[PDB]
Amino acid sequence: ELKDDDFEKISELGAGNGGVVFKVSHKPSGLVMARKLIHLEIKPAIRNQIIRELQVLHECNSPYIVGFYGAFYSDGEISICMEHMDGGSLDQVLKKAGRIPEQILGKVSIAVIKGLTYLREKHKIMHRDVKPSNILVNSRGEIKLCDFGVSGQLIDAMANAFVGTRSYMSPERLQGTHYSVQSDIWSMGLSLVEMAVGRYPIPPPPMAIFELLDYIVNEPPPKLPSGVFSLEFQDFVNKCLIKNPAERADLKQLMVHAFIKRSDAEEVDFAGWLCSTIG
Amino acid sequence: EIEASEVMLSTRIGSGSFGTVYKGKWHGDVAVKILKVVDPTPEQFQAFRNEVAVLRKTRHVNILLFMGYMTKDNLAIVTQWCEGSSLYKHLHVQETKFQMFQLIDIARQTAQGMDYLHAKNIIHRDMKSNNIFLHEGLTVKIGDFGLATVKSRWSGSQQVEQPTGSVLWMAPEVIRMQDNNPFSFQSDVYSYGIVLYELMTGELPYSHINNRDQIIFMVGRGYASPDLSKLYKNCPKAMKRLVAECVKKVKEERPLFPQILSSIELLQHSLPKINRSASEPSL
Amino acid sequence: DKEELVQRAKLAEQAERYDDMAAAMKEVTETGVELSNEERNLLSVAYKNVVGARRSSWRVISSIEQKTEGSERKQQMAKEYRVKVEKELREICYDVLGLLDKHLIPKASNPESKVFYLKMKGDYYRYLAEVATGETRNSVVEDSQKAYQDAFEISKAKMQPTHPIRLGLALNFSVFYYEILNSPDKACQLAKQAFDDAIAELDTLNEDSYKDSTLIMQLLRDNLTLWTS
Amino acid sequence: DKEELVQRAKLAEQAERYDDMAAAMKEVTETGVELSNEERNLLSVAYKNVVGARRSSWRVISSIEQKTEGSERKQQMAKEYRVKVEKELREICYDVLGLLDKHLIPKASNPESKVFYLKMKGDYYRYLAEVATGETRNSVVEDSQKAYQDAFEISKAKMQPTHPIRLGLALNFSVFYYEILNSPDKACQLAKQAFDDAIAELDTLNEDSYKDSTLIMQLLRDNLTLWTS
Ligand SMILES: Nc1ncnc2c1ncn2[C@@H]1O[C@H](COP(=O)(O)OP(=O)(O)OP(O)(O)=S)[C@@H](O)[C@H]1O
Ligand SMILES: Nc1ncnc2c1ncn2[C@@H]1O[C@H](COP(=O)(O)OP(=O)(O)OP(O)(O)=S)[C@@H](O)[C@H]1O
Ligand SMILES: O=C(NOCCO)c1ccc2cncn2c1Nc1ccc(I)cc1F
Ligand SMILES: [Mg+2]
Ligand SMILES: [Mg+2]
């Protein structure tokens, strides 16, 4: 198994509302992994249940899903051990590059759809957290998903967290409603929009998190600025950012959408561009 | 301020919304919270020291002692250590079984402490179950009060003026941020009412919601309120009336804390000794 | 006086006694005066708890009867007790319907009230159906079908897609389709359609009725996945 | 035959149907057959549930009765309804007392069983004393005191202080002292003595006697904590 003592932290990869992830080395194996510590105060039975639910991640093997080695509870914190992602998160790259190139955005959308359909098919799991900070990249050019809702009890525990700044919640999910994968698709669309423009698009060209939610519930969905993007991409994102879940395209429609096909046909040196924009 | 060489940091305790708590031994056992603010603005630092002085001025039984601050080991604040576990741990993590009069007395002590703070024009934002400790078995100790200028970030010489901390105890009128200064006495009253709900239910409000943003939106819209159906059956009727009055969506509807204390005293007067006795179970 | 009888029924409700409550409300119904919106809720809840207790009892009795799997007098006595409690439930439901098809459905000015009462009628016919096995099952099943359909027409006609009454009617009818008629495809279709129609008009949700709306919505979601498996 | 009625009572228990179990046990004991531990335990459980529901209801009714005295004649019918509840409350206890007088007390060949039956008699007299007022209350409590004292001597002479029945007897006696006699010091002294004896004679119980005994001791500590403050 995995225990606290077997890891020597190398660095702090980052910190979000939920917790903090450290790039550490597993001493018995000598490999660098990422260990996410989430602080929470729950009963030991809940902790055991959450560990058991996270044990499912052993067989969730996909080129579009981050790796996983184990999880344990050391002291008031749940520790999650996953493979180390060299490129970090797409939010980091958005901090590096002003705005993502459209070809790379297409490749990103292809990877995200592949991951979401892999989850919904072989695990019946909804990500529930499709965000720029939750998509990870590698030095070899791979794109993968992390921080998806495998453990329901863990989600219930994280329901007790501190207020946020920005949100990637589909308006149906804010309205106490859920349309299976359409909400994850809406999150994907908002992530691609926020990556295309060099800003958070919800206050379209600051506002409190409540005002952001009120806007994304009671206002028209954001759109890419026309004239600086191809038509297939704008149509794809307008399909993804649809208020009505039924009219919102599912995974199958997006897979054969024109923008996705155009992105798949194109050859993009994603690894080289990443190395350039992050050094 | 306080010299960092005087204090000695023991093993870490945990992390919170705006700081990380370690055990210290300066002039006895203390708690040192390392603040997350990295580069305090000079105006921010001056306001921080003003609030620190005001907090050192406080002296009450149900509120922890605020020793002072230090600027050497980053920016940190020193408070009186309490060995007793937090009320949140007792109700939820420990699921400690409290009798009805015990909970009434806990609520009365907490109301006394909050009344002390509000008598001094100190707004204990982030007032909640983790900020309440059961010192010496049943004494209530209130912590992490005030500190407006540190919990909220600062955009240079201007405070960010955005909500922070746990949302379950967050008042609706402060979730909306419909005013630049939504923090006042009534927000504390609402947070205290949520604490009362946890006491009288033993469970967190909005257990059916498992997304924080959904909670934010629904509470801000008024579409969700703590359901009083979870309240304990043995809970006195006036107690349920009080916990209903405290969590009123209307800001002006929530009563002030002197009224809270008066109501709790009347409840303790009316508290009979009939249902209190428990008989043999159907073993 | 009507107010004293309603206060007594509410008091028995607060006392967790659901026999003096049901009788008190039936006596109120026997007055032959039209109910108000508040008073209807007490009647519904009381006769709902009365029926649910016997339903749970019947479920556990039937589970034990299918669990024993032996050859002795215990199974016969369990069957006798099952038919006893079943007869009690039948009497309860028949008293309910006679109270309904003689004072409430015939005299209901408000169409919403008629939707409510036809919903009740279908629900109690379903309760009679799930226990009655044989030739008589087909009659109560079809009567429940007619009550549900008549309620559904009025709901689709003059009811909001987000009103709790209509959502509950849709849920009840989907459960009736899935369990009684054993037609999962059409039940799933009805649930999906009701889900979508409620999703469309989510912005129109006042403080008067919000918790019930999302509660029934989550129940519909749960039923959906339960059946899509 | 006897086992058939035992199975019927068990089935009524599983079905949450208690009045059926109460009658099914009252007919069992009416014969006067040799009573085993399980057989008497089921009767105690059934009767206890039936009267507990109604006594909780009465506590609620009496609490509501004193909610507001400055009103019209709404309390007039409330007190009559409470009288109705007591009429449906005293007579069951009297039936149990007559049952205990019929076979239970004479058909006792084990002092433990006599302790248990006298404990039950005192418990139900205590329940009657709560509703009973005036000289009636004193008349009832004089019987419960004597039953409790005759139970305590046999419990001390024949059973270990750690015995769960004896622990429960001490607990119930303490409760009666506190609630009716309003003698909190004597109740506290008795409870402390019983708990101290239980601690002094510990870690000698059977494997089965490791949950009930601990639960009774925990409840004793809870009562001690309540009465100290
Ligand atoms: N396997 C990994 N490799 C590299 N960096 C990682 C890895 N996992 C997480 N991170 C980093 O962890 C940082 C914090 O992300 P999370 O802890 O998942 O919370 P989050 O993405 O910030 O979501 P919120 O809403 O802000 S809490 C991200 O910005 C990533 O850079
Ligand atoms: N005065 C104190 N003495 C001892 N431990 C404390 C004290 N205050 C807080 N703690 C501990 O510090 C950890 C985190 O507490 P905090 O940092 O105050 O965060 P919080 O109390 O959960 O909520 P906030 O809004 O961040 S104060 C928990 O394990 C507490 O038990
Ligand atoms: O970490 C989480 N979120 O972080 C950002 C906000 O979602 C997270 C959130 C919910 C959740 C439910 N069950 C596990 N959960 C998480 N952990 C997690 C799961 C799978 C992998 I692979 C890696 C992980 F870190
Ligand atoms: Mg994250
Ligand atoms: Mg704290």
Author numbering:
A (entry chain B): 62 to 266, 307 to 380
B (entry chain A): 343 to 625
C (entry chain C), D (entry chain D): 2 to 230
Q: Anything the authors wrote about it?
A:
Although the 14-3-3 remains bound to the pSer621 site, it rotates by ~180° and shifts by ~35 Å such that it no longer sterically occludes the kinase dimerization interface. The open monomer structures also indicate that the pSer259 site is exposed for dephosphorylation in this state. Datasets used for the CRAFSSDD kinase domain open monomer and CRAFSSDD open monomer were recorded from the same grid, the latter at a 30° tilt to mitigate the effects of a preferred orientation of these particles.
CRAF (RAF1) is one of three RAF-family kinases that initiate MAP kinase signaling in response to activated RAS and is essential for oncogenic signaling from mutant KRAS. Like BRAF, CRAF is regulated by 14-3-3 engagement and by intramolecular autoinhibitory interactions of its N-terminal regulatory region. Here we describe cryo-EM reconstructions of full-length CRAF in complex with MEK1 and a 14-3-3 dimer. These structures reveal a fully autoinhibited conformation analogous to that observed for BRAF and two “open monomer” states in which the inhibitory interactions of the CRD and 14-3-3 dimer are released or rearranged, but the kinase domain remains inactive.
